[PDB]
Symmetry: D3
C-alpha cells in the first residue's frame, strides 16, 4: 500500500563488511533503507558520530536507496518519526537472538506498530563484529579483510593519535 | 523488478495462532505472501495436506495478498519457481535459530539469490507450536485459546474418527 | 503467606515427573534435594506413551521406591495423560524439573508457559544438577548397560540388579 | 517443624514488574522470602541502596511473608547467616541459565548446604529487565507498564535532578 | 621423562567415530585436518545398531575409502559396541568429534564426561567445521537427496553416484 | 610426521585447577605445549604478566614438555612465529563455544594454516573460571579447592597489600 522503509540501527563503530553485506541484501528487498547510527550514549565509542557516519556513507553510498542518519533517543520513537515499516537487525549468534527477541517484544509494548525483521550473515562474514574488529586493530592486527578501505585508514589515523 | 513476494513454508500441522500472527505481520510488509504447506513426506503429519491447506485458507483468507500452496519440501526449487524475493521463518527458540541459520547458508550455496528473513513471535504466541498443540489435543486438552476455530473443529473430527 | 503455618493447607506438594527408565543417581540427588525444601514430593512416573520404555511402569515404580523409600515425605505414582491435569488432581503446589542442558531449559521454559495458560495456578520450579551427576541420563545409562558396560557408579544397586535380570531375559 | 526461608538476591536497580511477579510466586511456595538487595559491587547502580530498598518495600510490602535487606559480600556467606533453605533466581535467557548453573555448583563447593532454585518468567514479563527499563526511562520513554508506581515516581525525581 | 620422538610409542592415534550415512564434505574436511595433526586417524563407522541406516556398513566403508583414501595415514573400519571399549582396543590417544552447533557441544561435553567415568584414559578432542561446511550433516543430505534435490555441492562424487543407485532401487 | 606444538593462550589471571587439567591432558597428546599468557593490557589484569607466568610455571613445571611465555595477544601472529600446529582452547559453556567457533573462522581467514582444537573440561572443573575465582577471593572466600597452592599465596599477597 505504501512503499517500505526499513531502519538498520547500530553504533557502527566502525562499519564492517558484515554491515555492508546486510545493508546490500536489505536494499534489494525494501524500497528505502536507513542506516541509523546511534550516538551511543555510554558504551563510549572509539570513532565520533561524524566519523562513523562518514565511514558508513563512503562504504555504502553506491547503493542509491540507502540513507545515513545519526540518532539519539529511543529506537521506538525514531521508528515512529521515520514512519518506518520495520527495524532490521543481523543475528550472528545465540546471544544476539535472545537480546533482539526481548527488544522486539519490549518495543512492540511501547508501540504496537513496531516491527523487527532479522537477517543472518553470509557465511564469510559470520564472525565479524565491530567489537572484535576493534580488539584486533587495537593489538595492531590487520583488519583489511573484514572492513572497507576507509575503515582501515581510520584505524591507522587512530593509532597515530595514540590509540 | 521490485514488488516483493515472500514464501512462508511449514507443515502447518495444524496452523496455530502463532502462524496467523506471523503471516499477518508479514502481509503488512511484503506485496505478496505465499503460505507454502510442505506435504511433509519424511514426517507423517496428523492432518492431510488438503486438510492443512483448508485450515490455512480459512484462518488467513481474509488477507487479500496471501496465497496458499502445497509443495514438496524442496525449498530452494520452490523459491526459484515462485520467483520469490525471500523466505520467511519465525524463530521461537534458540534451536530454531541455529537450524535456520544453517539452512539459510545451505540454500544460499544452492542459489546465490536465495534470501531468508526472520521474525520473532510476540510474547503471547511464543509458547505455541503445532507439535505441542497436537499433543495437548490428543490427550483431550482444550486448545481453543491457541488455534483458530476451524482447527478446534478439525481436532474434534479427528477424535470422532481415529485418534 | 496468610494461611497459618500450622495448617495442612500451608504445606507444599511438588510433582517430579519423568519416565525414570530407569531411575539414576541424578534423579535420586534431585529428589533428595527437593525433599528438604517441600513438605511432599511425588515421584510421578509417566507410563511413557511413545518412546516405549525398557522397564515396565511397575518395575520403574519399584526401582524408585527402593532407591528413595528412605525419604519419608516421598511418594511414587504412575500417571498417564496431561501433566497439567495430573497437577490439578494431585493438588500440587508446583512441578519440579531438573535442567541438565540448554535444550532442557528451552523446552521447559515453553512448557511452563503453555501449562500456565492451561491452568493459571500451574507453577514450575527448576533445579540444576550437581556436577558429579550432570553427565548422567537414563538414556545414556540404558545404552551403556545394553552394551554390558558397568553402570554401577551411576545408579542405585537395585537398578544394577534390574539390568542384570534384563540381560538374563535377553534384554 | 522446619520453615523454609528463601533468599532472592539481585541489584534491583530498579525493581520491575518481573521481580514482583517472581517474588509473588515464590511467596506462595516458601514460608519466608528475603528480597536481598546487593549493594552492587561496581557496575554502580543508578539508584542508591536506600532508594532500591525503599522501592522494593513499597512494591512488595503487601506480601506479609516477604522481608527486605541490603547486603554486600559473598552470597554464600549471606546464605549461611540468614539460615536460608535456598537461593531463588529467575532465568530469563540461556546466558542466565548457564551462569546460574555454574554459580550453583561453585556455591555448593563453598558450602555443601547451598541450594539454588529457579523460576522462569511468565511471558508477559519475559522481556522486562532493569537494564532495559533504565535505558528507556533515561531517554524519557514511558515505563509505567513495566514497573510499579513508586518506580515511575523515582525516575521522575531522577530527571528533576538531571539524572 | 618422555618417550623419544623416534619411538612408535610417541605416535598418536585418533578415532573419528560416526555412522557416516553417507560421508559428506564436512567429514572430509575434518579428517583432512585431523590427518595433519595426528599420526594415525581411524574413520570408525558405527554399524548403527537399529538406527536403520540408508547405506550398508560395507557401502559406507567403501564411500569413506574412496573419499579419503588419498590420505595415507587414514584407516577405515566398521565397529559396533561401546565407543569406550573400541577406544581401548584400538589403543587410541583420543576420539575426535566435530562440533557444528550448540546441541552438538552439549551432547559431546556430556559424552566425554561419561566416557571418562567409564575409562579414565578416555580423551575427546573437538574441531569446528570450516565455514563453508558448517551446515552439512548426513541427515540433512539424506533428506535433500530423498526429495531428489541435488547434493553434489556437499558430498564427494562417489556419494552422488551411490544416491543415484539408491533412487534406481526405489528410494 | 613432524612434531606437534600446540599453543594454549589465555590471560591466566590467575591460573586455576581448570587450566592445569587442560594443560595436563594436552601434554599427553602433543609433543610440545606452550602456555601463552596474553599480557592483556586492556581489561587490565589483577596479576602482573610476570606473576602470572611464574604462577603457571610453578603449577605446571612438573610437565617436562610444557613451556611458559608471555605474548601480546595477537594470536594468529604468535601462531605463525611459534610454528604451531594448533591452538588449544577449553570450552566450558555455550558462550565459549560460540565465541571460539567465530574466532577460529576469523583466524583461519587470516592464515589458512591456522588450526584450533578444543577440549571440554572434566566435570569437577567445569564451574571454575579465573573471573569467578578472583571475585570469590576478593570477598575473602576460600579458593583453596579451585587453584594451586601458589595461587592461594598470591591472593594472600594481594590481601596483605589491601585488596
Amino acid at each position: 500500500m505504501s512503499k517500505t522503509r526499513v531502519i538498520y540501527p547500530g553504533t557502527f563503530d566502525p562499519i564492517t563488511n558484515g554491515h555492508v553485506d546486510l545493508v546490500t541484501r536489505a536494499s534489494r528487498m525494501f524500497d528505502e533503507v536507513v542506516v541509523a547510527i546511534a550516538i551511543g550514549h555510554h558504551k563510549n565509542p572509539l570513532f565520533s558520530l561524524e566519523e562513523r557516519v562518514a565511514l558508513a556513507q563512503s562504504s555504502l553510498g553506491h547503493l542509491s536507496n540507502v540513507e545515513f542518519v545519526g540518532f539519539d533517543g529511543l529506537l521506538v520513537n525514531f521508528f515512529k518519526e521515520q514512519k518506518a515499516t520495520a527495524v532490521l537487525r543481523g543475528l550472528r549468534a545465540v546471544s544476539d537472538f535472545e537480546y533482539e527477541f526481548q527488544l522486539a517484544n519490549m518495543n512492540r509494548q511501547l508501540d504496537p506498530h513496531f516491527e523487527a525483521v532479522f537477517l543472518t550473515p553470509s557465511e564469510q562474514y559470520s564472525f565479524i563484529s565491530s567489537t572484535l574488529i576493534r580488539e584486533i586493530a587495537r593489538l595492531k592486527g590487520d583488519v583489511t579483510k573484514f572492513v572497507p578501505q576507509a575503515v582501515v585508514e581510520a584505524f591507522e589515523r587512530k593509532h597515530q593519535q595514540g590509540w
